[PDB]
Each structure stands twice: as C-alpha cells, then as structure tokens.
Amino acid sequence: MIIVTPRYTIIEDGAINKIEEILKKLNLKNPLVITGKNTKKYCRFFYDIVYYDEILNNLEIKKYTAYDCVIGIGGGRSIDTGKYLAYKLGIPFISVPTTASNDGIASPIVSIRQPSFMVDAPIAIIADTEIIKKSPRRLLSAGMGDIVSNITAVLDWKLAYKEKGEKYSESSAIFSKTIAKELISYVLNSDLSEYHNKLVKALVGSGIAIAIANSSRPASGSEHLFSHALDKLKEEYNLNINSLHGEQCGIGTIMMSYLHEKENKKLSGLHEKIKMSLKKVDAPTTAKELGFDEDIIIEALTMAHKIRNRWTILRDGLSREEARKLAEETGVI
Amino acid sequence: IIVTPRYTIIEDGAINKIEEILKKLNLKNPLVITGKNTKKYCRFFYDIVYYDEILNNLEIKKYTAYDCVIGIGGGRSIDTGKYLAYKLGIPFISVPTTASNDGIASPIVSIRQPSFMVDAPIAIIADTEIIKKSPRRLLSAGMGDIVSNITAVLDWKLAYKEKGEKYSESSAIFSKTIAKELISYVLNSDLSEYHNKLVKALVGSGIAIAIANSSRPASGSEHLFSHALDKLKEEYNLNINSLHGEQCGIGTIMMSYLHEKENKKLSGLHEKIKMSLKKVDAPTTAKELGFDEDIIIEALTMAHKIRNRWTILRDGLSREEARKLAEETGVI
Ligand SMILES: NC(=O)C1=CN([C@@H]2O[C@H](COP(=O)(O)OP(=O)(O)OC[C@H]3O[C@@H](n4cnc5c(N)ncnc54)[C@H](OP(=O)(O)O)[C@@H]3O)[C@@H](O)[C@H]2O)C=CC1
Ligand SMILES: NC(=O)C1=CN([C@@H]2O[C@H](COP(=O)(O)OP(=O)(O)OC[C@H]3O[C@@H](n4cnc5c(N)ncnc54)[C@H](OP(=O)(O)O)[C@@H]3O)[C@@H](O)[C@H]2O)C=CC1
Ligand SMILES: O=P(O)(O)OC[C@@H](O)CO
Ligand SMILES: [K+]
Ligand SMILES: [K+]
Ligand SMILES: [Zn+2]
Numbered sequence: 001m002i003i004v005t006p007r008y009t010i011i012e013d014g015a016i017n018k019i020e021e022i023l024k025k026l027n028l029k030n031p032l033v034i035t036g037k038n039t040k041k042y043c044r045f046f047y048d049i050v051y052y053d054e055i056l057n058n059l060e061i062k063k064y065t066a067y068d069c070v071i072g073i074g075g076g077r078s079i080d081t082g083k084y085l086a087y088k089l090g091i092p093f094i095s096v097p098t099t100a101s102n103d104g105i106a107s108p109i110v111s112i113r114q115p116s117f118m119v120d121a122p123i124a125i126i127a128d129t130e131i132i133k134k135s136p137r138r139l140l141s142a143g144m145g146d147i148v149s150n151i152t153a154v155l156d157w158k159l160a161y162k163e164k165g166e167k168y169s170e171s172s173a174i175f176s177k178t179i180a181k182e183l184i185s186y187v188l189n190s191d192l193s194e195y196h197n198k199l200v201k202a203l204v205g206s207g208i209a210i211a212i213a214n215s216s217r218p219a220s221g222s223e224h225l226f227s228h229a230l231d232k233l234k235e236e237y238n239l240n241i242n243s244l245h246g247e248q249c250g251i252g253t254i255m256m257s258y259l260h261e262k263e264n265k266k267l268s269g270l271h272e273k274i275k276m277s278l279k280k281v282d283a284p285t286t287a288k289e290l291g292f293d294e295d296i297i298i299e300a301l302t303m304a305h306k307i308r309n310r311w312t313i314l315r316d317g318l319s320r321e322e323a324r325k326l327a328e329e330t331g332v333i
Numbered sequence: 334i335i336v337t338p339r340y341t342i343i344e345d346g347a348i349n350k351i352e353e354i355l356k357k358l359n360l361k362n363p364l365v366i367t368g369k370n371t372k373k374y375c376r377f378f379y380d381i382v383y384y385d386e387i388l389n390n391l392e393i394k395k396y397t398a399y400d401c402v403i404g405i406g407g408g409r410s411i412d413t414g415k416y417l418a419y420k421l422g423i424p425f426i427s428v429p430t431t432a433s434n435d436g437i438a439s440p441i442v443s444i445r446q447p448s449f450m451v452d453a454p455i456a457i458i459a460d461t462e463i464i465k466k467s468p469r470r471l472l473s474a475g476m477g478d479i480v481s482n483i484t485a486v487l488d489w490k491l492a493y494k495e496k497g498e499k500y501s502e503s504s505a506i507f508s509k510t511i512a513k514e515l516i517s518y519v520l521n522s523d524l525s526e527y528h529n530k531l532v533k534a535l536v537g538s539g540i541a542i543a544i545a546n547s548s549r550p551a552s553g554s555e556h557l558f559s560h561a562l563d564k565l566k567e568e569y570n571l572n573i574n575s576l577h578g579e580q581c582g583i584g585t586i587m588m589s590y591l592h593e594k595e596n597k598k599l600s601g602l603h604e605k606i607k608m609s610l611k612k613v614d615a616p617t618t619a620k621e622l623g624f625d626e627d628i629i630i631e632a633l634t635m636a637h638k639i640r641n642r643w644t645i646l647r648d649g650l651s652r653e654e655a656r657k658l659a660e661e662t663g664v665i
C-alpha cells in the first residue's frame with residue numbers, strides 16, 4: 001500500500017487568490033502555468049504561462065528544467081496536460097480548475113490519450129467556486145454525468161471482485177458510491193443554488209477515492225468504457241460532435257445501471273433515478289440530445305468492453321441486437 | 334482548507350523509506366521525537382529527543398535548525414511530535430511502531446484535553462514488520478479505537494437529526510465502513526493479517542477526520558467516556574495503565590447498546606462489537622480494564638459534560654441509568 005494524495009484542498013469563493021500562499025506553504029518558488037485560450041483570463045499573476053496546445057504535439061521536445069512545479073489552470077484538458085507535464089518533469093502539480101466538468105481535478109489519472117494511466121495526485125487543489133459558478137452551464141451539467149458514473153463503476157468493481165477476484169476495497173467503494181448518492185439526493189431535493197459547490201466537492205472526493213484505491217475503479221467502469229468508445233468513433237468517422245466526456249458518461253451510466261438491474265432486482269429503478277438527476281441539472285439523457293445517431297450509440301455499446309481489459313457488467317460483450325434493446329429500453333434511443 | 338497527508342506507506346520494511354520520502358518532500362534536517370522503548374527503531378543519523386524532555390518544558394526554540402519533525406513510536410511520541418511541528422511551523426511525519434490508535438494519521442493533537450486540530454501529518458510511514466512485533470496489548474487496543482467509529486458516526490447522525498449539526502454522509506459512511514470491514518475480518522478469519530488490516534483502518538480513520546475537518550467520524554460518546562476515565566485517573570491519582578483504545582472499546586460496547594435501545598434496526602450491534610473485541614483479546618469489562626465499578630459509573634455520568642458535543646448520552650445519565658447500562662452490557 002503506497003498512496004499519494006493532495007496535501008492541500010481549498011474550495012471557496014476567491015480561492016484563486018490563495019495560489020501564492022499555497023506555494024509558499026509547499027516551499028515552491030518557480031511554477032510553470034499551463035492554461036487554455038478561453039481560460040487565460042483567470043491567470044492573474046506573473047508566472048510563465050503556456051497553452052496546452054503548443055505542448056500536446058511538439059510534446060517531448062529540457063525547455064522546462066528550471067521550474068519546480070506546474071500549475072494547471074482551466075478545464076479538464078489544461079489540468080490533464082499540466083498533470084502529465086509535471087509527471088514527466090518529476091515535479092509537483094497544482095490543480096486550479098475553472099469549471100467542474102470532470103473528476104480529473106483531483107485525481108491521479110492522466111487521460112491525454114487512452115489508455116489512461118496513473119501518476120501522483122495533485123499536491124494541491126485550488127477550486128475557486130466564484131469562477132466555477134460562472135463557467136458555461138453545459139460543463140457544470142456534464143460534471144453530474146461524471147459523478148453518477150461512480151455508481152456503475154462501483155457496481156462493476158464489486159462484480160469483478162466476485163467473478164474474477166480483482167482486488168477490491170469496500171470502504172473506498174462505498175465512499176465513492178455515497179459521494180454520488182449525496183449529490184443525486186441534493187440535486188433531487190434542493191433549489192440547486194449550491195449545485196456548483198456540491199459538485200466540486202463531489203468531483204474532488206471522487207479524485208481522493210481513486211488515490212486511495214490506487215485505481216480508477218471507484219470512478220470508472222463500463223459507463224466510462226462506453227464513453228471512450230464514443231470517443232474512438234468520433235475520431236474514426238471524423239464526426240464533428242461537441243459532446244463532453246461527462247455527458248457521455250452520464251448516458252452510459254443510465255444504460256449500464258439498467259444492465260445491473262437485470263441481474264439484481266434490489267437495484268430496480270436505479271437507472272431511472274439517475275436519469276431524473278441528470279435531467280434535473282439539464283445534462284443530456286438521450287442520443288439525440290447528445291448529438292449522436294442511434295447507430296453510433298449501438299456500435300459504441302458493442303465495442304465498449306474491448307476498450308480496456310477491465311471486467312464489467314458488459315462481460316464479454318453485447319451483441320448489436322442486445323445493444324439496441326438496451327438503448328431502447330432506457331430511452332437513450 | 335483541507336489538509337491531508339501527501340504520502341502514505343504501509344508495508345513491511347517501510348521504516349527504510351524515511352529518506353526516500355524526505356527527499357520527495359525536499360526535506361533535509363528532521364528532529365526525531367521518540368520514546369525510550371521505541372528508540373531501538375531509530376536507525377539513522379538524525380537528532381533524537383524523547384517526548385518527556387519536551388513535555389516538561391514546552392515553550393523553552395532550540396529548534397530553529399530543523400525543517401521537519403519525525404514522530405517514531407507509540408501514540409504519545411506521535412502526538413508530541415505532531416504538536417511540536419505545529420508550534421515550529423514545519424511538516425510532521427508520522428512513523429508508528431504500533432497500531433494502538435488513530436492519531437497515526439489524524440490532524441488531532443491530544444497532549445492536553447481538550448484536544449485540537451492541526452495539520453494532518455505530511456507523511457505516514459507504517460512499517461508492518463515492526464508493528465507486527467509490537468506488544469500484543471497495543472494491537473488489541475487499536476481495535477477499541479476503530480470500533481469507536483461506529484458509535485461516533487451514530488452519534489454524529491443523531492446530532493444532525495436532533496440539533497442540525499453539520500453532517501457529511503460520505504465521510505461518515507467511509508468511517509463507519511472502515512470499522513465494519515475490520516469487525517467482519519476479525520470475526521471471520523484466522524487473524525493472520527490483523528495487524529495490517531488494523532493499521533489500514535487506523536490510517537483511513539485519520540483521513541476521514543481530515544476530510545470532515547472534525548473528529549466527529551471517529552469520536553463520539555465512547556470517546557467522551559474514555560476522556561472521563563482519564564479525568565478520574567488524574568483526579569483520584571489512580572495507578573492504572575489502561576490504554577486509550579481499551580477504554581474506547583468498552584465505551585463503544587456501552588454506547589452502541591444505548592443506540593440499540595432506540596433503534597431495532599441495530600439489534601445485535603453491541604454484541605457483535607463485544608465479540609470482535611474479545612476475539613482480539615481486547616478488554617470488555619471494568620475488571621479486565623483495571624477499574625472499580627464506581628469509576629465506570631462516575632465516568633458514564635460525567636461523559637456528556639466532557640465536551641460540548643451532542644451524543645446518545647444527550648443531557649446525561651443518572652447514576653442509576655449508568656449502573657444499569659454497565660450491568661446490562663457486562664462491563665460490570
Ligand atoms: N484526468 C482524468 O481523470 C479525466 C480527464 N479528462 C480530460 O479532460 C478533458 C475533458 O475536460 P472537459 O472540461 O470536459 O473538456 P475541455 O477541457 O475540453 O473543456 C471544455 C471547454 O470549456 C472551457 N472552459 C472551461 N472553464 C471555463 C470558464 N470558466 N470559462 C470559460 N470557458 C471555460 C475550456 O477552455 P480552454 O479552451 O481555454 O481550455 C474548454 O474550451 C478530456 O479531454 C480529458 O483530456 C476527462 C475526464 C477524466
Ligand atoms: N491526537 C490523536 O489523534 C490521538 C492521540 N492519542 C495520543 O496517544 C496516546 C495513547 O497512545 P498509546 O500508544 O495508546 O499509548 P502510549 O503512547 O503511552 O504508548 C504505550 C507504550 O507502548 C510503547 N510502544 C509503542 N510501540 C512499541 C513497540 N513496537 N515496542 C515496544 N513498545 C512500544 C510506548 O513506548 P515509549 O514509552 O517508548 O513511548 C509506550 O510505552 C495518548 O496519550 C495521546 O497523547 C491518543 C488517541 C488519539
Ligand atoms: O480510467 P479512466 O476511464 O480514464 O477514468 C478515470 C477518470 O476519467 C475519472 O472517472
Ligand atoms: K467518475
Ligand atoms: K476512532
Ligand atoms: Zn471521468
């Protein structure tokens with residue numbers, strides 16, 4: 001058991017102004033900032049700044065040997081790139097999200113390219129809820145999709161334990177699952193005035209659960225496989241579809257939950273509750289809303305189990321006919 | 334602000350990873366705080382000091398030269414190192430040589446009651462080969478500190494419901510589940526990995542505290558009871574070397590029984606906790622713990638006053654109620 005977690009986590013209005021304080025506490029002096037064109041406006045300091053584009057191709061091409069840490073400011077891509085870069089340089093990474101679209105905020109996962117892999121958790125998470133509150137609404141709605149995914153991820157994890165003796169941690173699993181349930185329950189019971197705040201807390205919690213389990217298992221299962229398959233097909237067929245990771249995972253969750261329901265009647269109705277929670281925050285729940293033809297959904301379903309060697313409710317895979325029935329019966333198509 | 338450990342290592346030989354960890358944290362000159370019985374595990378060049386020597390004097394900065402503190406040993410070594418680090422404004426590394434309580438990774442300092450919050454240790458380095466060999470009584474005491482999470486979380490939920498205290502379901506259930514898994518392991522195995530599963534549980538419990546920013550998920554009425562016992566030991570000058578965990582275990586037995594009375598859903602909880610303690614040879618009675626029945630009773634009646642923290646004890650037990658409770662649960 002060797003586990004790397006964040007040292008500092010700040011979630012509050014104006015948190016972006018604590019960067020200096022946090023750097024000082026960690027005895028860090030020379031960061032490189034990674035950001036995006038749309039998020040550069042929040043980089044209010046004098047550190048060196050670089051856009052994640054102009055790293056992601058040149059890639060490996062000591063230009064960076066002077067920096068003692070990396071600060072990722074922005075969306076999932078900014079953070080993911082900064083995280084990867086920090087790993088390559090052997091230095092600490094500070095995560096400064098400007099939205100709440102995915103759990104990459106505090107996770108040890110780097111997802112530049114599939115397959116994903118593990119690195120250190122960010123040494124600090126500085127989440128300015130004033131900035132995040134104003135981020136495009138669609139991104140906040142997408143975060144719900146990433147959170148509900150923990151439910152099917154955990155069901156899949158238990159399943160792999162039972163059927164394949166995969167290493168399993170009950171306390172990590174229930175932590176992850178409960179994070180999602182807290183948020184669902186908040187979404188279904190409230191006026192949503194603190195949604196952004198509770199969402200960020202959930203995404204961060206989800207990152208910590210990953211760190212603690214030393215695996216993306218508590219946060220990524222078949223629903224994520226489905227989303228990754230969608231991604232492969234967008235690239236393959238050159239679809240120009242602006243769907244987000246969280247949105248895809250949310251829809252995946254709906255379907256995968258339903259598969260677990262078939263085998264365990266105690267869970268019956270789970271998928272509908274999830275669906276409701278997604279609709280309540282305006283996340284998409286159908287292929288049409290997400291921007292996909294029904295055939296892409298189906299194909300993604302049939303290929304999802306092959307995306308990674310990770311046992312899930314999909315087992316050895318869905319037939320085309322099964323996939324269609326599933327998507328039909330859950331209202332996705 | 335939430336402060337958690339950065340690094341956590343739990344494995345055989347972990348004590349040899351001190352330097353690796355110091356290097357990762359860019360740290361070079363620690364002050365080591367240890368005990369006379371644990372000094373033998375201090376195999377390195379660093380300055381060493383015993384926790385007595387510090388605890389006498391306190392305020393009197395001969396320490397300017399150190400860039401961190403490493404606590405090596407039992408709960409007291411760790412607690413003192415933790416406190417000292419806080420006072421010096423430098424990071425603390427926790428190196429437990431046994432598994433006797435959840436101070437290992439917690440943000441709590443407990444040198445004087447009442448206890449208070451500081452930073453969680455920056456690193457936890459838990460050598461399960463050393464811990465495995467620690468006195469068995471200490472390992473048994475750890476079980477007492479873990480089962481406490483069950484009543485702590487029940488008390489937390491109760492305070493939420495009856496007083497609108499701030500509550501976090503996902504922290505609570507994490508804490509609770511840590512305890513449930515260990516109980517279920519203790520009741521269902523040959524115990525060959527007890528020390529390991531115990532240390533993981535104790536560390537998890539520390540993390541839950543940090544995440545909740547409160548000792549709520551790990552400390553409730555059972556702890557109030559243990560603190561009361563401590564007050565009485567000092568007051569009556571009793572010479573009784575009961576451990577914190579042992580006291581908390583026995584507290585949990587009783588407090589879980591109080592919760593059971595109000596909620597049928599929990600039937601057999603108290604019994605199962607008791608069984609689990611017996612299975613690892615933790616004490617479950619006053620006699621075993623070394624206390625006269627009147628001390629137990631007095632501790633029960635004063636426990637709700639130990640801190641301003643609502644529990645199943647509510648506004649307090651009468652002497653009569655306390656005696657019944659202790660009787661009914663087999664404590665006396
Ligand atoms: N590591 C992990 O575990 C995970 C990582 N990921 C990674 O994250 C990516 C998904 O992240 P996601 O956020 O969904 O997508 P993007 O990172 O592509 O972000 C979407 C867009 O929103 C913009 N944006 C973000 N915040 C604000 C703000 N406050 N104001 C205005 N615009 C804003 C970004 O701007 P800009 O263009 O300036 O960046 C970006 O253009 C994936 O491609 C993958 O790389 C995804 C899931 C999990
Ligand atoms: N703040 C927190 O989170 C909490 C802190 N605590 C702290 O912990 C204390 C209780 O800790 P606890 O460990 O129960 O009691 P002690 O620290 O008194 O430890 C008991 C004894 O065990 C010895 N010891 C420890 N490990 C070994 C080993 N491997 N081999 C031989 N001897 C060993 C210690 O030796 P030595 O004499 O050399 O130290 C000590 O003599 C409290 O007084 C409090 O300060 C307790 C609960 C919660
Ligand atoms: O392991 P993957 O599927 O990238 O997921 C981890 C991350 O996306 C959070 O859920
Ligand atoms: K997730
Ligand atoms: K405890
Ligand atoms: Zn994800």
Ligand SMILES: [Zn+2]
Pocket residue numbers: 434435478556577581
């Ligand atoms: Zn305790």
